[PDB]
Amino acid sequence: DVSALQLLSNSFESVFDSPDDFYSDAKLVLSDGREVSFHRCVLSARSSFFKSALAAAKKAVKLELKEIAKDYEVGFDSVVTVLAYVYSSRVRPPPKGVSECADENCCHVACRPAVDFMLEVLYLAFIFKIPELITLYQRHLLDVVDKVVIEDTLVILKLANICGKACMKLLDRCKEIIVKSNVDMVSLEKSLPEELVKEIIDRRKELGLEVPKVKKHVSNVHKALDSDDIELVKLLLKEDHTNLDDACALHFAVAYCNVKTATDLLKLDLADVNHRNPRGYTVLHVAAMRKEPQLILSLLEKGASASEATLEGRTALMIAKQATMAVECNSLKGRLCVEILEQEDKR
């Protein structure tokens, strides 16, 4: 009888909506500081993970999310959605702004905020061992992954590996997408664990694709830029074995290295700032992807052209808009960054 079942669902959803009025006996604390109240029986029945955790904690109950789910920092709205599904078997939608970016032209289907929200909910469903939610959100990400940019597909693949064997479809799809694209070897090495890098290189070389080796001196420059050794890169360039254009040292410093290192690299002025890379991004594009205001300001004070587009036709303003969520324009890093970019573009 579906009516009585829906009445049960409505009653428990009303319980979740006001847990103090229905004898809430436990609390789940997030990484930000906020907390969600929940009842021990419901989550001891719906999930095996919480049953084991609660039986171990009992040997007013607080559960630290940063300890049980440790491999991915999840937000508040994702935890709210997962717990709402646990109580009422109903997928509660996220509030406006969280799963939407700051680009009014973006449909907010594949932009970065929506991907991040979907990742957080899928990881929560994996940690809590809820197979139906896992399958539903894995299907969501498999439907959307074909439109998201490759740099975010890297993060999707990372989290798919975090979920182990429960997300085989998503992991294989992301691996195929990453293999088919022309991702730099340094990006793979600095974005994925050693196992994934080895697997991707083996699968790429097995398919007969172009897997060029890294120049030894260029690799030396990259590790020097990774160990905060500006004087090392200087002494190596004295040898004239490498050039900053062929090594893309600016792209590396802006993407992965520290802010002060990239600043010190810019203060030497021995590299074309508007130079591109095999993926087609300029230094200003990587500065927009990082959302670091000091890099964008120092690049604009050095002549960075903001009117250049990528291979897909996307400019720096679009990158800044699609990297920030709509909450910040409706840590003030994203907001400030996009504001500065907009100001420079209008000038």
Partner: protein, 209 residues
């Protein structure tokens, strides 16, 4: 003896300060702090090693035999003992992979340091061998017959001369390393050396469990 008691307590304090210094090195290296402040910690570490060598020379004047015995070091370190310490060429080889990448100029300088260290090591080893045969021969005579004090005196000075020469070789090796490498590379190498020594101490504990 008072000199050996003072040496062992002083060495305890040296070990505690070495530990603290390492703990500060790693912290600075991780916090990605700038070169200027790091150089103060680097030269302080070198000064601390210099103080070790000075105190070792003072202990050597009191009792050269104790210094050569390595009793003041843990058991596992004794496998690398040579005239009161470690083999510089092997410790440089140990730390080489972690100071990487080296420039071509740095690579030539380090291998030349390695060759000079090896030849000096062989010459000191041969000198010590000659000392040991001269001591066996001179001691053997003293019992057959019923000058002896003067010969014993010169022989005590010869042992101190060897340990002094080994400490000088060590201080030159440290100085040449501090001159070949940048501040960050030198810090990385000193970090590798410190973790090497700490792991050796842990293993020395582990063999006595």
């Amino acid at each position: 003896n008072s000199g050996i008691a003072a040496f062992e307590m002083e060495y305890t304090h040296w070990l505690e300060e070495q530990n603290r210094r390492v703990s500060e090195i790693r912290t600075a290296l991780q916090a990605h702090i700038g070169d200027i402040e790091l150089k103060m910690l680097v030269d302080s570490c070198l000064n601390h090693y210099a103080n070790l060598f000075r105190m070792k020379a003072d202990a050597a004047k009191a009792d050269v035999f104790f210094l050569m015995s390595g009793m003041w070091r843990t058991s596992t370190e004794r496998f690398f003992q040579w005239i009161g310490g470690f083999r510089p060429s092997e410790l440089l080889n140990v730390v080489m992979p972690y100071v990487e990448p080296l420039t071509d100029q740095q690579l030539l300088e380090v291998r030349n340091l390695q060759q000079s260290s090896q030849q000096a090591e062989e010459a000191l080893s041969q000198g010590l061998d000659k000392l040991q045969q001269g001591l066996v021969e001179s001691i053997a005579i003293q019992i057959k017959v019923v000058a002896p004090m003067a010969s014993a005196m010169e022989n005590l000075q010869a042992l101190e001369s060897f340990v002094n020469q080994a400490d000088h070789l060590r201080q030159q090796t440290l100085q040449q390393m501090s001159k070949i490498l940048t501040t960050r590379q030198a810090a990385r190498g000193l970090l590798a050396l410190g973790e090497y020594f700490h792991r050796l101490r842990a293993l020395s504990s582990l063999w006595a469990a």
